[PDB]
Amino acid sequence: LKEKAIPKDQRATTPYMTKYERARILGTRALQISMNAPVFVDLEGETDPLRIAMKELAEKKIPLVIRRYLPDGSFEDWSVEELIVDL
């Protein structure tokens, strides 16, 4: 099935990013950055992959998307770009 993917219109999870989604985005991006992936932000003299990832997140220039699974197995995909980062 692909009744699994919940559409952009009519989506209901928090429009905010979870503490976990942040920890995993920062980690994932720092891991990718750390193993020589192209960086989408201008490192203004930055060198720690986490600090670079944080800059990436701060400028919403992280090209990842969170696939939020529901208990039935369905999902809502949310872009790092669109999620509110209060935290």
């Binding site: 529901l70 208990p71 039935d72 369905s74």
Partner: protein
């Protein structure tokens, strides 16, 4: 005076709970019908000197205009009290056929001490109509009135369908209620029927849980 006076009080207390329960099920019972005083009770159902005549007590009740819009098939109920402490098949069959003839949906038998297993055979014998056996002694206090007992609300086929839809649920996933649970018995819950329980919360003000029958 002696103990006949207490036995009458007890019966009257139990009769109120039957009326309360029947109203609560979605039947047409006035508040006056429930709030019937003890002196008015003796007036209606006490014989030649003052002994309770349970044979008379037996009554029919009809679904309220609201109950038919939510549950259209929910038909008229019959409630029967027996003057004999033990209920035999010779007095049980009389009741069973009354439900069959008057095309009744449900029938509640309020028994004093016991209903013989020979008489008990007759309970599922006349479907689709369902029969309920209730011990007089249990009904003296309306348990639903207790501090700790929250409000349980029977959900319609449509109401339940919507519940499962809106939470993407399989019936198995829903928190359960035993078919023999005191409140389940009170509301005359059948298997599969879902009950919406509304309790007060110290966290939110009000919280609603749901329990599926078994």
């Amino acid at each position: 005076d002696q103990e006949n006076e207490r036995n009458i009080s007890r019966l009257w207390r139990a009769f109120r709970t039957v009326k309360e329960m029947v109203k609560d099920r979605g039947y047409f019972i006035t508040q006056e019908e429930v709030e019937l005083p003890l002196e008015d009770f003796k007036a209606k159902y006490c014989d030649s000197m003052g002994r309770p005549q349970r044979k008379m007590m037996s009554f029919q009740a009809n679904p309220t205009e609201e109950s038919i819009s939510k549950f259209p098939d929910m038909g008229s109920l019959w409630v029967e009290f027996c003057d004999e402490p033990s209920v035999g098949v010779k007095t049980m069959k009389t009741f069973v056929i009354h439900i069959q003839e008057k095309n009744f949906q449900t029938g509640i038998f309020v028994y004093q001490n016991n209903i013989t297993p020979s008489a008990m055979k007759l309970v599922p014998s006349i479907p689709p109509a369902t029969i309920e056996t209730f011990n007089e002694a249990a009904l003296v206090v309306n348990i639903t009135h207790h501090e700790l007992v929250p409000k349980h609300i029977r959900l319609s086929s449509d109401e339940k369908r919507e519940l499962l839809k809106r939470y993407r649920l399989k019936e198995s996933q829903l928190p359960r209620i035993q078919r023999a649970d005191p409140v389940a018995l009170y509301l005359g819950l059948k298997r599969g029927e879902v009950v919406k329980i509304i309790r007060k919360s110290e966290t939110s003000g009000r919280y609603a849980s749901y329990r599926i029958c078994m």
